[PDB]
């Protein structure tokens with residue numbers, strides 16, 4: 017068995033000549049002796065913590081059912097032949113050169129690249145929502161790119177089925193997804209069970225593609241909202257009246273009036289069409305926030321918009337021991 021930086025990689029014999037990439041998991045590249053190409057392989061060791069088992073089952077179940085050019089596929093899954101012997105799971109994927117988080121650390125994107133990246137994000141997200149699934153953790157590091165700038169959404173560990181009938185909750189309720197990309201209703205009255213929470217994160221991603229800096233880099237839970245309101249300004253009477261929870265409404269009413277900051281003042285080099293779509297994704301009221309199919313038809317994406325080339329899903333959509341059993345069952349098709 018080949019090893020890489022301490023831990024081992026029981027991926028032989030089909031996958032050889034491993035190389036570290038990054039890091040209860042770990043990712044390396046490997047040579048696929050069957051297909052004669054180098055691939056990506058991530059090792060997952062989740063079975064002692066149930067929250068890890070949850071993320072693993074969600075990711076595997078969803079990605080095995082999804083097939084889309086802008087969503088990372090699972091080509092293979094390696095694991096022990098029995099439940100007792102299964103400690104680790106290996107997910108094999110197409111090899112990508114980088115991700116958008118790493119690329120934004122050092123590279124200035126041209127408007128052509130920004131436009132092409134955004135189109136691909138929304139084309140993939142269109143498929144996800146057509147399956148009645150919410151990603152719930154979209155961010156630059158979950159967008160993979162290869163050497164010809166093909167983009168694929170990855171990491172579905174927090175994804176769930178949309179449930180807008182049960183989205184309402186109290187003020188300041190606990191949340192899991194990545195802070196800088198959370199919509200304002202998360203901190204006020206929403207469990208994040210509707211499609212609008214993904215669109216907000218994509219808006220945050222567009223803004224970050226425009227300046228190589230996160231637009232709302234909150235340092236803690238409620239600080240996230242202060243950042244969002246410092247740029248969007250105070251919510252209108254109509255948006256406030258849609259918030260019936262008294263604690264959340266009275267918090268917003270307790271704030272001093274704040275003016276909206278113009279997008280063209282924040283991003284003076286940006287294309288005006290990109291800023292118009294930005295505004296519609298980063299809308300405060302989630303019922304007014306643009307949807308993914310509307311975003312694809314925005315003039316900014318006119319060079320690429322082709323609804324017959326933007327396919328949708330055919331088939332839309334517990335303790336540690338059952339989850340490990342279900343992961344074993346879900347991966348049996350690649351045995352062996």
Ligand SMILES: N=[N+]=NC[C@H]1O[C@@H](n2c(SCC(=O)O)nc3c(N)ncnc32)[C@H](O)[C@@H]1O
Pocket residue numbers: 037038039041042043056058109110111112113114115160170171
């Ligand atoms: N895990 N982790 N972090 C370590 C590193 O993995 C990198 N990476 C992932 S990570 C997918 C996921 O997050 O599920 N997939 C791939 C892939 N197909 N090809 C190349 N690189 C990948 C990601 O760029 C980060 O640098």
